[PDB]
Design a protein around this nucleic acid. Structure first.
Lengths: 55, 19, 191, 67, 56, 144, 141, 142, 100, 77
RNA sequence: ACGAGACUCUGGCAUGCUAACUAGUUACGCGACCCCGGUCGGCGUAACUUCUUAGAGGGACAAGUGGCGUUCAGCCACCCGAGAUUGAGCAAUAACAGGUCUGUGAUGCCCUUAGAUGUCCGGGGCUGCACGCGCGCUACACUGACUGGCUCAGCGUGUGCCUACCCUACGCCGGCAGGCGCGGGUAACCCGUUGAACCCCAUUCGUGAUGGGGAUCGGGGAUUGCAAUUAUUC
């Protein structure tokens, strides 16, 4: 029953259900507008999305 | 299209593909 | 063309100021006549633009204090309306004049400011500008009203009103007269 | 304060030195002249330049100028 | 109209030291750095360690 | 209607407690444990009694009526959810439990928790917070 | 003539509550004696008959703006919720109380079921509202 | 004959008040309600400032319908008291000789400036590091 | 023939250029054309900490992305719209052809 | 230097009632607060006495408000 | 030559211009009601941009007047004017043994690597209390509390990729927390004309740790989830 015990923990919700698109990190994720990135890499790749800084 | 995501999601996804 | 500008029912005309020092710093007479103690604003953009403000609006502004009551203007308007009702009932004449006579009699004519270094309380007696005189008069009357209308059955309407009658002649039982006498005697002390 | 920059003052001095018979004391008229005969990348810079041109005219109409 | 190269990292030693190679004209403030200077940051994997490059 | 009457009750000896007579008839009965500012309105709402009267001027008939409403409420048209003691652990009898009744009920619930030896009973015996809150930097009134 | 907008609503709601009490046709429920009007209230309502005043306010609010259902009127008769140590927050009222008021005004001949999820006024209800507005205006003047 | 109608706005912070002046009998109402009954009742004379300041013979020839949206209460009251005066001045400019406009405008500016011009005061943006636009959070030492 | 064409882009200048190009094409077509309906601009706001750390002054940065939408109504079938919109398009703009 | 703990009466007495009924119309200022101060009377009771005296037609109302109410001596003319 | 300034965004205005049944206004007709007129976000259609939306232009420059000053740069007051110092963004050389190896398949060296200091599953802990400190929330009341009524906004977000989990109108049951069918929206179209609170009005309370304050504690009922004890929340 290893094949049914290795993934016996549900992952429908919680922090481990979410995963970062770029670095697979569970911390500092943004879920606004379906981005699913950490804050640091969103700051790094902020320019080519179209997000500009002018406020 | 049945799923039809929003205008903001289209631009965010297009930036994702460009990156 | 209205020949008189009532504050609802109280005439702004035929008032006389006994002090020539505060003639142009008290705004009641025929140019600064409204129908409410609630102005539009823009009176604190320059240095001396607050001198053109009506004195009922200045007391209305200085009534609200102490965090809980900040921002409440209409409530202060109806408090000073009921207060002027009490002045009219207890005296019989125009309550604008009692507001004029209380401000003159409660403004400190002398003051003591700090001098020198720290370590000893050394002060120098100086003169008081007439704008600071009416500012200290309004602040002392509002502070005395706040201290009287606290932890008592007496309402704010009477506790704004009956000190003005006591400050009209200086009956030695009001807050502003006592603190003005204290300021005058401590200014005479370090002279 | 309102103190003009070396760029505005230099451009106004050289536009007085090059052009003199096409200007005047009216601010809007020589503002339009300064828009036409030069390349200015902003409206505010154009207004500042035309204002210093008008001040230079008020200086020049009195007596000689050392610059 | 102008360019500059900055190389940072462990350059022939133990302490990290930066070499800056400036010439020409170069602005740094306001908006015009968006569309007059082009910035590219790269990492170089040497045997001794890492190295960073900024060219504008 | 506004002057004082005779036989005025000053101190009320009802349900072995003291009730001051100068307060309102709704809010002077709040000195009894088990009744507060919310149960006191409904006991005087089912009884045909005026609410604008002081508690000292009432008569024994209306006093006994209010006592019967607050003593046996369930058969006297009071909803079950409005009672404080619902689904008792011994028998499940719905009742508005009296002052010394709540004192005895509280001490026997503490004795039940102590004899069952639960986490709540252990924390009550030690004298600590039982609702599961942080007490590292708060609750300094324990001892010294 | 004179409408509801030409007279103050403060005396109007009391007069409409008195007239609707005098009609005696509201089929008021049985648990109105012991109920709280919202989840954020602290005590019972101090008035002996809150249901007639609530029904009058519901009728005149339906006159000013119709098409509102049960959940639309819960936003109206709600306010600040004091949670004690917490910072305060906005909270709605009781849905079933407003629903029973709407059923009462539908059973009485004032409120009909409006299309597209609303409840409008019968023109007899408009007749009653305008007539009592005229009576209150005549009593004031 | 042809209709003589003007439409004049008026704002204080964000509450706009658009007044519709046309030829008719003399009666003034906003949102279907007269000027005598608008809550709050404290600002009643402040609402009534143009009529008692200017005379009932000036408002006798027109009726006014005003539609509003935005703001709070005091801003709305100031929007009405600006919009009525500006609409009346615009109507007299449009259809009456200009001497009446001068004789109404000099006394209207003489009473208070904001009867004909708006207030250039809006809320500014709140910045990080504090609970307001100017205030900052408390700083702890040691 | 009530058709509604949406036109969205990041840019304003190229959006207005292609809108004016389609308008002057419809005017040279001698066809009844409606004007542009300037939709309200939606702004996407992201505020985050500049540092990757928890050390330093509490400083935040602001990110924006404006969205501009234009509408064009026309009175022609789909092939005329195709032959007028398939030529010389801006790379920032996008289209959506509908019929109602 | 003393608290002077107040124990205000909730209903009247034999001398207080006719004492105020002969005295308080002769005052120039009559408010429930001030008559509660000079007669040692609870806040609600002073209010109830003033609309009772208003219903008796011996006290003239000048202003009605939820916060402060002011009551006057009748004119001697 | 850099930095400052110059530059970008926003706010304040234009009854002039270009266009809006996914925003409206005014007229006209049909409706409902009061007494010859008034009201209605009720219905429909003859123009238009007053409100609203967002594009190009315009506008403010120490421009005019009176004083001060090497009549220098510049300063002050004032008329007319929506503004005669709006707020933010970007932000130079040189370095600090400043923080991050726990943001990264960014990383050198060192250590471990099957009885794993890698991985996965079940349970516990990060919450544990003589005490001290920092940022905060609630109040100490009657300029107030409780109960009804009155009436007023703007940034916004919303059915998801392996992502199951969205925002809610309407009708029913129940004190309330809450429960299935019922329809709309991939959005100025639907929640929504976001009936926000503080205010305003009318009673009740009366200086009493009281109807202030709601900490502590007992019982019961609900949703989320595989699971709530060391109460998740209500």
């Amino acid at each position: 029953g290893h094949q049914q015990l290795y993934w016996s923990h549900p992952r429908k919700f919680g922090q481990g259900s979410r995963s970062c698109r770029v670095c697979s990190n569970r911390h500092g994720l943004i879920r606004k507008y379906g981005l699913n990135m950490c804050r640091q890499c969103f700051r790094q790749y902020a320019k080519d999305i179209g997000f500009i800084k002018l406020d | 299209m049945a799923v039809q995501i929003s205008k903001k999601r289209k631009f965010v996804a297009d930036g994702i593909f460009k990156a | 063309t209205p020949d008189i500008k009532l504050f609802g029912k109280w005439s702004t005309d035929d008032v006389q100021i006994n002090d020539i020092s505060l003639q142009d710093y008290i705004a009641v007479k025929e140019k600064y006549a409204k129908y409410l103690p609630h102005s539009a604003g823009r009176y604190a953009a320059k240095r001396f633009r607050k001198a053109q403000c009506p004195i009922v609006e200045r007391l209305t502004n200085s009534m609200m204090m102490h965090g809980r009551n900040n921002g409440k203007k209409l409530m202060t308007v109806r408090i000073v309306k009921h207060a002027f009702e009490i002045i009219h009932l207890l005296t019989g004449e125009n309550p604008l004049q009692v507001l004029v006579n209380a401000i003159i009699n409660s403004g400190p004519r002398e003051d003591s400011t700090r001098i020198g270094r720290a370590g000893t309380v050394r002060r120098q007696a100086v003169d008081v500008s007439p704008l600071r005189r009416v500012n200290q008069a309004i602040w002392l009357l509002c502070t005395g009203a706040r201290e009287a209308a606290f932890r008592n059955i007496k309402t704010i309407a009477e506790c704004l009103a009956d000190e003005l009658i006591n400050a009209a002649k200086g009956s030695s039982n009001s807050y502003a007269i006592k603190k003005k006498d204290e300021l005058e005697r401590v200014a005479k002390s370090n002279r | 304060g309102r103190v003009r920059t070396k760029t505005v003052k230099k451009a106004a001095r050289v536009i007085i030195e090059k052009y003199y018979t096409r200007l005047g004391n009216d601010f809007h008229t020589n503002k339009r002249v300064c828009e036409e005969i030069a390349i200015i990348p902003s409206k505010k810079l154009r207004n500042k330049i035309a204002g210093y041109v008008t001040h230079l005219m008020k200086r020049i109409q009195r007596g000689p100028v050392r610059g | 109209k102008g360019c500059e190269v900055v190389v940072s990292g462990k350059l022939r030693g133990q302490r990290a030291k930066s070499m800056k190679f400036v010439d020409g004209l170069m602005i740094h403030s306001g908006d015009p750095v968006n569309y007059y200077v082009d910035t590219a940051v790269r990492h170089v994997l040497l045997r001794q360690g890492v190295l960073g490059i900024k060219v504008k | 209607s506004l002057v004082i009457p005779e036989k005025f009750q000053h101190i009320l000896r009802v349900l072995n407690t003291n009730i001051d007579g100068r307060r309102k008839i709704a809010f002077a009965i709040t000195a009894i444990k088990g009744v507060g500012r919310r149960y006191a309105h409904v006991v005087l709402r089912k009884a045909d009694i005026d609410l604008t009267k002081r508690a000292g001027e009432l008569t024994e008939d209306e006093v006994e009526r209010v006592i019967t409403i607050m003593q046996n409420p369930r058969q006297y048209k009071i909803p079950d959810w409005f009672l404080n003691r619902q689904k008792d652990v011994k028998d499940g009898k719905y009742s508005q439990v009296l002052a010394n009744g709540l004192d005895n009920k509280l001490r026997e619930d503490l004795e039940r928790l102590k004899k069952i030896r639960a986490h709540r009973g252990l924390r009550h015996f030690w004298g600590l917070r039982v609702r599961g809150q942080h007490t590292k930097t708060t609750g300094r009134r324990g001892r010294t | 003539g004179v409408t509801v907008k030409d007279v103050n609503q403060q005396e109007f709601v009391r007069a409409l509550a008195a007239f609707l009490k005098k009609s005696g046709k509201l089929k008021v429920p049985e648990w109105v004696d012991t109920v709280k009007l919202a989840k954020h209230k602290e005590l019972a309502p101090y008035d002996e008959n809150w249901f007639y005043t609530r029904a009058a306010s519901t009728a005149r609010h339906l006159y000013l703006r119709g098409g509102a259902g049960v959940g639309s009127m819960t936003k109206i008769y709600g306010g600040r919720q004091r949670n004690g140590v917490m910072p305060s927050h906005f909270s709605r009222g009781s849905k079933s109380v407003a629903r029973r008021v709407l059923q009462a005004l539908e059973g009485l001949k004032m409120v009909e079921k409006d299309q597209d999820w609303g409840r409008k006024l019968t023109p007899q209800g408009q007749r009653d509202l305008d007539r009592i507005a005229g009576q209150v205006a005549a009593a004031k003047k | 004959g042809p209709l003589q109608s003007v439409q004049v706005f008026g704002r204080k912070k964000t509450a706009t008040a658009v007044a519709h002046c046309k030829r008719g009998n003399g009666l003034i109402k906003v949102n279907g309600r007269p000027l005598e009954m608008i809550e709050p009742r404290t600002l009643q004379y402040k609402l009534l400032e143009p009529v008692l300041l200017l005379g009932k013979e000036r408002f006798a020839g027109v009726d006014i319908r005003v539609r509003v949206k935005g703001g709070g209460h005091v801003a709305q009251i100031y929007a009405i008291r600006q919009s009525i005066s500006k609409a009346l001045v615009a109507y007299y400019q449009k259809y009456v000789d200009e001497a009446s406009k001068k004789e109404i405008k000099d006394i209207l500016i003489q009473y208070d400036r904001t009867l004909l011009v708006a207030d250039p005061r809006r809320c500014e943006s709140k910045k990080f590091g504090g609970p307001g636009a100017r205030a900052r959070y408390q700083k702890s030492y040691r | 023939h009530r058709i509604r064409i949406t036109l969205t882009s990041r840019n304003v200048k190229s959006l207005e250029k292609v809108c004016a190009d389609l308008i002057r094409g419809a005017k040279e077509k001698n066809l009844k054309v409606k004007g542009p309906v300037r939709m309200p601009t939606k702004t996407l706001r992201i505020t985050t900490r500049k540092t990757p750390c928890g050390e330093g002054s509490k400083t935040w940065d602001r990110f924006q992305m404006r969205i501009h939408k234009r509408l064009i109504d026309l009175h022609s079938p789909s092939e005329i719209v195709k032959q007028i919109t398939s030529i010389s398009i801006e790379p920032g703009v996008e289209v959506e052809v509908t019929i109602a | 230097k003393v608290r002077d703990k107040l124990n205000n009466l909730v209903l009247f007495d034999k001398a207080t009632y006719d004492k105020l009924c002969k005295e308080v119309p002769n005052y120039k200022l009559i408010t429930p607060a001030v008559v509660s101060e000079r007669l040692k009377i609870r806040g609600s009771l002073a209010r109830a006495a003033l609309q009772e005296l208003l219903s008796k037609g011996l006290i003239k109302l000048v202003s009605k408000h939820r916060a402060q109410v002011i009551y006057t001596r009748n004119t001697k003319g």
